C-alpha cells in the first residue's frame, strides 16, 4: 500500500522526534498547532477503519506512532492541570471552565454515554481516573443529576480536583484518593473509566472482582485513525465481561465509548 | 467472554453438521428456514464491528464457524444452478429471474457500487466469478449499458451462464472461460472482483501483475455480524493497493464493496 496520510505521519513524527522523552516540558500554547496537525488526519472521515488498522499496524510506523502518543498523552495532562489552577483562581469559575480546550467535545461526549448507559437523576456514578479537572464528575451531576465519586490515584492531584468541584460549586460530587479496589466498598448504578486510567489490564481485572452482572460498566477507548493517539484497549484487557454497546465518535470527539457488562 | 449468540450458532452448526451427515446434495427448499435464522444474526444492526470480530472470531466459534460458511456457499451455489436452469426453460425469462431469493439484494448491492465505481454507459467492466446465474454481468449491460466480460473459471458453468444471458436476450455481456490471469489479455474500465471468487490471495496477486495504477477494482467482502456468513478479504491478501473507498450493506444486503487501487 500507498496511503497519503504515511507521509504526513512520518512528517509530523519527525518534527516530534527532537521532544522524545521529555514531552512534560512543552509549552501548551505554542503546540497547539502540531495537535491540529495530528486531529487533522484523526478526525478525516474519508479513512476507513481498515486502511487506518494498515497504518497504525505496520512496524514501520512503530516509532512515529510512539512519538505521537507521547506527545498527545502529555499535551492533554498540561491542558488540564493548567485549566484546573485557572478555575481555582478564577471569579468566574463555570465561564473559565467553558473556554478549555475539550469542553465542547466533552458534552458530546457524555451525551452519547448517557444515551449508551441510560443514565437517569439520582443514580449512582462512580468514574475511575478523575485527573486534576474532573470535567465528567462534573457533568454526572451538574447535566444529568448523578451522585458521583470520583476516584484519583494521587493524592495531589486528587486535592486540586476537589478544589475545582469546590470553586464551581458543583453538588453530589466527591474525590476519593485511591486505587480502583476503592469500590469494594461503594454502592453504585454505573461506573466509567477514563481513557486514561492505567494499567488496563490491573483496573479491569480489579473491577471484575467488585461489580456484579447487573452494574453497567461504560470505558473509553479509540478506534479507527483516532487510535493514532492512544493505545486502543486490547481484547484481552476486558476478558470477563461481554460487549453490550458502542458509541464511534463524530466531529472533534476523540473516544469510542463502550458498554460492558460482567460475565454471565 | 459469555455471548448469548454463542449458544445459539452453536446449536445452528450442530443441526448442519447432522443435516451434512445423511445428504451430500442440499435440499433447497428444505434449508431455506436455517437460512433465515442465519440471516437474522448476520442482520442484527445493534451490533458494531468490534463487538462482532469478538463474537464470531472467539476460538470456541472456529467449527460452527466453518460449518455456516459451508452451507452458505453450498446454498448460494445450489440456488443459482437451480435458478439458471429454470430461466433457460422458461416462457417468462424476467419473471423467473425475478423470482430468484436474492434478486432485490443485487439491484441494491449495484446501485452502491455504480455510485462508488462511478460507472458510466459505454465504459468496459470485467466481472470475475459470475456463477451459474450470472446477475451482476446481465445489470451492469441491462441497467448500467457497460460492455461486460463476465469470467467463469468452471467450463459446464461457463456454458450454463451463457445460455441464461440468451435466454434473457441480453446484448453485450460475454463470458469467458478461465482464471482470473484472461485479464491480461482484456482492456477494461472498472474490474470487479465476486464475493466468492477464490482464493483471494492469489486473485489479487494475478490482478496486480495485469492492471495499472489508474484502473478502478471492486472488490466485494463481508463485515461486522455478515462475516457469520463467509471469511472477509484481509488486508493481506490486497497488499500493492490502496483502499480509496467502501460502501457498508444495510437493510438485508450482504456485501461490503471496497473501491482499490493498485500502488503507487
Ligand atoms: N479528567 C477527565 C479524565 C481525563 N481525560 C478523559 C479524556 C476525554 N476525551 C475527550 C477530550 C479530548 C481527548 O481526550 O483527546 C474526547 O474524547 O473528545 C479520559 O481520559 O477519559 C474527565 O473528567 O473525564
Ligand atoms: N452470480 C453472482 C456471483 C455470486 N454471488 C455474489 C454475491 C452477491 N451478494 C448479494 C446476494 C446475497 C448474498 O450473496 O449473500 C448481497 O450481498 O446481498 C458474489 O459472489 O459477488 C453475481 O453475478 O454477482
Ligand atoms: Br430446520
Ligand atoms: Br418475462
Known amino acids: ?114 444515551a449508551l448507559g441510560r443514565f437517569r437523576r439520582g443514580e449512582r456514578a462512580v468514574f475511575i481516573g478523575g485527573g486534576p479537572l474532573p470535567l465528567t464528575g462534573i457533568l454526572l451531576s451538574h447535566v444529568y443529576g448523578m451522585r458521583v465519586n470520583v476516584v484519583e490515584i494521587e493524592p495531589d492531584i486528587a486535592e486540586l480536583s476537589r478544589k475545582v468541584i469546590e470553586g464551581l460549586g458543583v453538588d453530589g460530587v466527591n474525590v476519593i484518593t485511591g486505587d480502583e479496589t476503592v469500590i469494594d466498598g461503594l454502592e453504585f448504578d454505573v461506573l466509567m473509566v477514563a481513557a486514561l486510567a492505567e494499567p488496563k489490564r490491573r483496573v479491569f481485572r480489579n473491577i471484575h472482582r467488585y461489580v456484579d452482572t447487573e452494574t453497567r460498566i461504560i470505558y473509553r477507548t479509540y478506534t479507527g485513525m483516532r487510535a493514532i493517539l492512544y493505545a486502543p484497549v486490547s ?30
Open 235 to 264: 481484547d484481552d484487557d476486558i476478558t470477563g465481561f461481554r460487549r453490550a454497546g458502542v458509541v464511534l465518535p463524530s466531529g472533534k470527539v476523540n473516544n469510542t465509548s463502550v458498554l460492558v457488562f460482567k460475565c454471565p
Open 1 to 114: 500500500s500507498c496511503y497519503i496520510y504515511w507521509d504526513k505521519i512520518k512528517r509530523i513524527a519527525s518534527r516530534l522526534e527532537g521532544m522524545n522523552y521529555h514531552f512534560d516540558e512543552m509549552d501548551t500554547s505554542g503546540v497547539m498547532p502540531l495537535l491540529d496537525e495530528i486531529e487533522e488526519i484523526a478526525h478525516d472521515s474519508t479513512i476507513d477503519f481498515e486502511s487506518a488498522k494498515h497504518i497504525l499496524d505496520d512496524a514501520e510506523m512503530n516509532h512515529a506512532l510512539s512519538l505521537i502518543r507521547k506527545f498527545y498523552v502529555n499535551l492533554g495532562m498540561k491542558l488540564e492541570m493548567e485549566k484546573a489552577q485557572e478555575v481555582i483562581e478564577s471569579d468566574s469559575p463555570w465561564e473559565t471552565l467553558r473556554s478549555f480546550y475539550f469542553y465542547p467535545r466533552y458534552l458530546e461526549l457524555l451525551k452519547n454515554e448517557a
